[PDB]
Ligand binder design. Structure first.
Ligand SMILES: [K+]
Ligand SMILES: [K+]
Ligand SMILES: [K+]
Ligand SMILES: [K+]
Ligand SMILES: [K+]
Ligand SMILES: [K+]
Ligand SMILES: [K+]
Ligand SMILES: [K+]
Ligand SMILES: [K+]
Ligand SMILES: [K+]
Ligand SMILES: [K+]
Ligand SMILES: [Mg+2]
Ligand SMILES: [Mg+2]
Ligand SMILES: [Mg+2]
Ligand SMILES: [Mg+2]
Ligand SMILES: [Mg+2]
Ligand SMILES: [Mg+2]
Ligand SMILES: [Mg+2]
Ligand SMILES: [Mg+2]
Ligand SMILES: [Mg+2]
Ligand SMILES: [Mg+2]
Ligand SMILES: [Mg+2]
Ligand SMILES: [Mg+2]
Ligand SMILES: [Mg+2]
Ligand SMILES: [Mg+2]
Ligand SMILES: [Mg+2]
Ligand SMILES: [Mg+2]
Ligand SMILES: [Mg+2]
Ligand SMILES: [Mg+2]
Ligand SMILES: [Mg+2]
Ligand SMILES: [Mg+2]
Ligand SMILES: [Mg+2]
Lengths: 68, 89, 106, 245, 126
RNA sequence: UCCGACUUUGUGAAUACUUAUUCCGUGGGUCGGAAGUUUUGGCUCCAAGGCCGGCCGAU
RNA sequence: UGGCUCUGAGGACCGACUCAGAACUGGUACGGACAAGGGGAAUCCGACUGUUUAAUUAAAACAAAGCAUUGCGAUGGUCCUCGCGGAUGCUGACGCA
RNA sequence: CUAAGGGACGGGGUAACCCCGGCAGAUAGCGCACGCGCCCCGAAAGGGAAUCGGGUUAAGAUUUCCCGAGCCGGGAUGUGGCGGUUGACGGCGACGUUAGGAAGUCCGGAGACGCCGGCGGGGGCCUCGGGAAGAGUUAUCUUUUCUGCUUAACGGCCUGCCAACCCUGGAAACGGUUCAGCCGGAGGUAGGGUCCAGUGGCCGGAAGAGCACCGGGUGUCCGGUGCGCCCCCGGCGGCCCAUGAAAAUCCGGAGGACCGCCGUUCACGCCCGGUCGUACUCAUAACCGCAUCAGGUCUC
């Protein structure tokens, strides 16, 4: 497993062809976005409520999205 | 202190006879002594094995006597070899 | 106090069977098998450690398993000779070569 | 009777030498053109211990005369040799301790070790620690040389035989009392299966000619013919005299 | 007094250890950034290769090429030689540095073709 | 196991020879005759060059 | 030599054990179970540590360090093998037997 | 894979069975015509490609099944990046950065090593306290007694022990320093740095798991201490007429023949992974002692 820091790098990874699904995990602190790729699971931590929503709406329409 | 005559040989206790302990004393002392290194100029040469004498700091290793760095005949042989070499010329 | 068992069929405390105790998220203690301590690269003329390279088992240095910066040092005789050894060889190579010319002239 | 212990050693079953941790044969480099006509320089890289051998060995590296290769040698170290020292082998090598020379190049009185008996033997004489041979005289007609061996015997050798200058390192080893059966046990543990010796008088007659009796006694002369069969040849063999003079 | 511009040295440490270089400027006392004495040198990162008659014309043009590096070196990391190479160099950014390297490459390639300074272009063997 | 005879066992001078036989060494790497590298614990190979694939360099 | 109530000393950037001292007190009991040398004066033998007759002998027997003697310079000594060959020997008298 | 060792082609011996492996015999082949050229077997305790946590059965899995998360080896193939001063930059330097030519030939290291004694470090365990959850005792006392309060391989960043190394500088009125040592003009003390290892810290994995409670919900927290015990590591000292394996395998280096739209040990991406063992006992009843035998039988 690997962590992603900036939002844009998560955007390109979720747009990868080998990306299969995105899991959204809600914690009491932040919101974790996990995209399952071929070799690694990439996790990005969003500490902002609206940035989580903007990320949710701006995801690629072709990728599956799951709520955890 | 701690002993009047035994010295290093007191590790053997009362065993083996007084004459044998006195015999081994000189070689026990000499083989555990620190010798002068002609290459670097320090008293850092220690016996690594019988005949092998290595300096701690400069790292030179030298073939010498069994229980002393230079045997008496080694000095005599070197002088004979040196005199033969010069007189050969 | 949660005594432990070996996890494979090796029953003898050999150097290749060394274990460590770890706590799992299951709240218990299990054995994990470790790797034997390995020397790193060594210098042949000084005997000292070669700086800049990790101490691994020989097959952990394999190219597919280790990055190139970790494997090498950027200097002639990089992972083979230390810096002091390389300096001495350069100076010896040049100074003896000058003596060869002086022998030729004289 | 049964086969005596002296006979059983020739089968070499449990009496073979212990050589598992030995560093290799110690001997000169094979005689070649460069040594026969000039000199060749090698450098001493290590002075090491050989199990079962009192004398230290010297690791020496040469450059191969015609191949692009290193040539690593290992012979008995003369006293005074050291790591990083240049040694020279051959007809034109200087008379210095640690150098290997033909006997023709060593004047009368020189101290030598690892002396060849045949030209190209790589060293046969005076190899144990602290031992050496002395050059006595030279014969230019026959091309032979006279040397004195450590046992005192004179020997005639070809003048082309090679020897190292100096005496063998590690001398004085046997002046130290062993003091313990255990020290003797460790000495012979790396040599052979020979150390704890049982006296023949302490045996039964089936096992030894000295065995038996209601007292421990040989019962016949311990001096024995040179031509006695094995099993019979025990005690003092072909002795010209006995006792302490 | 033998560490002057135009004098040839040998680098003893670093990435360019064992390479031959020429001094360009000497800061004998040292700057404020570098208290120790040091000099700017121009050295050979890649020596011109062995050029022989049997070779074809295109190939010998490729073997005559050199690469040059610029480096500030402590005096203690330099082996000063007795040789001298003068090519009138008289010398910050990653673009100014590489451009200045290319100028010295042209001058040093031209000196090598002249046939002089055979020691300077013939590597060291250790 | 020592010792003698025969066999292996030949050749030529008034004891010599060498090819049988025997032993030793080498990755069978400079043998016979003639002609004309001591340096400091560094590197050293697959020829530069010259002259007509060829010769010298490397008798 | 117990119990109890204290006292002093020894530190780090609030702490841990140890060691000394005192008073009081019990049917003189206190290393309260457990755990845990009997000592001395001599004679014989073997120096000592080690070893041994598995299943009647552990010893004064064997070994041992030390001392001494013998053979042997490799075309050798000692020994094995029907034979060819082999052990010592990756050895060379400060060595092997 | 090799160890002690065993077998064995040719050759030698032998009536044959069979006994001999260094006695050297055109050695039976390897790279790119050209070049080079000094058999096998033998260890489920030696060496060694790569896995973790949680769950699951009447019986398995102390790593094989399920869930999730990785890794190794091999093979094809792109997309992006990287280099052309043809074969990258930075640093005085130790050295750093995911990339960043190359053939025959040659060189080094790791693998890779004894016993004993202190000292230091890390992990686990034990132990003292605080908080919260539940349980025990409760004539009296007891802010009390008990239980639990967890965090894997793998990846990134930080840290950086004890040694080792680098730069400046130049020491007697000698200093630095360990439990012990010991160290210094062959450059100390000091100042500033590089590297090394970790079973160290934080984040990802990962709370969604597991556990404990209450009926879906709550919680899974904060400290202290040590000649403590077990394992591992580090670094010194001692000892030897004792000096305490080898090979497979892997990495690095010297050289630079040869070569340009071709190179690329980089990232991401695609495919594949054979055979045999695996239950159970391991002992006062699963083994041997004629037995369900007070014996014997190697370990954590
Ligand atoms: K590195
Ligand atoms: K018999
Ligand atoms: K024995
Ligand atoms: K005896
Ligand atoms: K008798
Ligand atoms: K023999
Ligand atoms: K195995
Ligand atoms: K081992
Ligand atoms: K692992
Ligand atoms: K199983
Ligand atoms: K039983
Ligand atoms: Mg008897
Ligand atoms: Mg008899
Ligand atoms: Mg009496
Ligand atoms: Mg006794
Ligand atoms: Mg006893
Ligand atoms: Mg017994
Ligand atoms: Mg009995
Ligand atoms: Mg009895
Ligand atoms: Mg006596
Ligand atoms: Mg094999
Ligand atoms: Mg073998
Ligand atoms: Mg046969
Ligand atoms: Mg096998
Ligand atoms: Mg194993
Ligand atoms: Mg089971
Ligand atoms: Mg001790
Ligand atoms: Mg400092
Ligand atoms: Mg986490
Ligand atoms: Mg939960
Ligand atoms: Mg234990
Ligand atoms: Mg290179």
């Amino acid at each position: 497993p690997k962590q992603i820091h900036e939002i844009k790098d998560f955007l390109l990874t979720a747009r990868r062809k080998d990306a299969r699904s995105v899991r959204i995990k809600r914690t009491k602190d932040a919101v974790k976005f996990k995209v399952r790729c071929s070799r690694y699971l990439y996790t990005l931590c969003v500490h902002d409520t609206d940035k989580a929503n903007k990320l949710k709406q701006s995801l690629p329409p072709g990728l599956n999205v799951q709520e955890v | 202190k701690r002993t009047k005559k035994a010295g290093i040989v007191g590790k053997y206790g009362t065993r083996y006879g007084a004459s044998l302990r006195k015999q081994i004393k000189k070689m026990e002392v000499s083989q555990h002594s620190k010798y002068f290194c002609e290459f670097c100029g320090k008293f850092a040469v220690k016996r690594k094995a019988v005949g092998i004498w290595g300096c701690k700091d400069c790292g030179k290793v030298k073939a010498g006597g069994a229980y002393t760095m230079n045997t008496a005949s080694a000095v005599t042989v070197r002088s004979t070899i040196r005199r033969l070499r010069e007189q050969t010329e | 106090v949660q005594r432990l068992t070996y996890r494979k069929r090796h029953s003898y405390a050999t150097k290749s069977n060394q274990t460590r105790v770890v706590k799992t998220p299951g709240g218990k203690l299990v054995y994990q098998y470790t790797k034997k301590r390995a020397s790193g690269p060594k210098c042949p003329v000084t005997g000292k450690k070669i700086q800049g390279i990790p101490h691994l088992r020989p097959t952990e240095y394999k190219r597919s398993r280790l990055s190139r910066n970790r494997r090498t040092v950027n200097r002639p005789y990089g992972g083979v000779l230390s810096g002091p050894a390389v300096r001495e060889r350069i100076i010896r190579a040049f100074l003896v070569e000058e003596q060869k010319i002086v022998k030729k002239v004289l | 009777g049964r086969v005596i212990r002296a006979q059983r050693k020739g089968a070499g079953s449990v009496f073979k030498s212990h050589t598992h941790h030995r560093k290799g044969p110690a001997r000169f480099r094979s005689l070649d053109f460069g040594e026969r006509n000039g000199y060749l320089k090698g450098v001493v890289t290590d002075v090491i211990h050989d199990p079962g051998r009192g004398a230290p060995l010297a690791k020496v590296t040469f450059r191969h005369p015609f191949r692009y290769k290193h040539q690593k040698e290992l012979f008995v170290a003369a006293e005074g040799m050291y790591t990083g020292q240049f040694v020279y082998c051959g007809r034109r090598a200087t008379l210095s301790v640690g150098n290997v020379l033909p006997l023709r190049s060593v004047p009368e009185g020189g101290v030598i070790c690892n002396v060849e008996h045949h030209v190209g033997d790589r060293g046969v004489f005076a190899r144990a620690s602290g031992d050496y041979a002395i050059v006595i005289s030279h014969n230019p007609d026959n091309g032979t040389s006279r040397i004195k061996l450590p046992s005192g015997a004179k020997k005639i050798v070809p003048s082309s035989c090679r020897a190292m200058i100096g005496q063998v390192a590690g001398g004085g080893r046997t002046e130290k009392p062993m003091l313990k059966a255990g020290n003797a046990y460790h000495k012979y543990r790396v040599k052979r299966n020979s150390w704890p010796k049982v006296r023949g008088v302490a045996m039964n007659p089936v096992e030894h000619p000295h065995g038996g009796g209601n007292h421990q006694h040989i019962g016949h002369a311990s001096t024995v013919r040179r031509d006695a069969p094995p099993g019979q040849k025990v005690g003092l063999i072909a002795a010209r005299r006995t006792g302490r003079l | 007094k033998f560490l002057k511009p135009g004098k040839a040295v040998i680098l003893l440490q670093g990435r360019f250890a064992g390479r031959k270089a020429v001094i360009v400027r000497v800061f004998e006392e040292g700057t404020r950034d570098r208290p120790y004495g040091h000099c700017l040198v121009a050295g050979l990162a890649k020596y011109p290769k062995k050029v022989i008659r049997k070779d074809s014309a295109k190939k010998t043009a490729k073997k005559s090429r050199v690469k040059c590096f610029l480096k500030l070196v402590n005096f203690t990391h330099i082996m000063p030689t007795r040789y001298t190479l003068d090519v009138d160099f008289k010398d910050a950014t990653r673009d100014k540095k590489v451009a200045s390297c290319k100028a010295a490459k042209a001058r040093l390639e031209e000196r090598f073709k002249t046939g002089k300074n055979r020691w300077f272009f013939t590597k060291l063997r250790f």
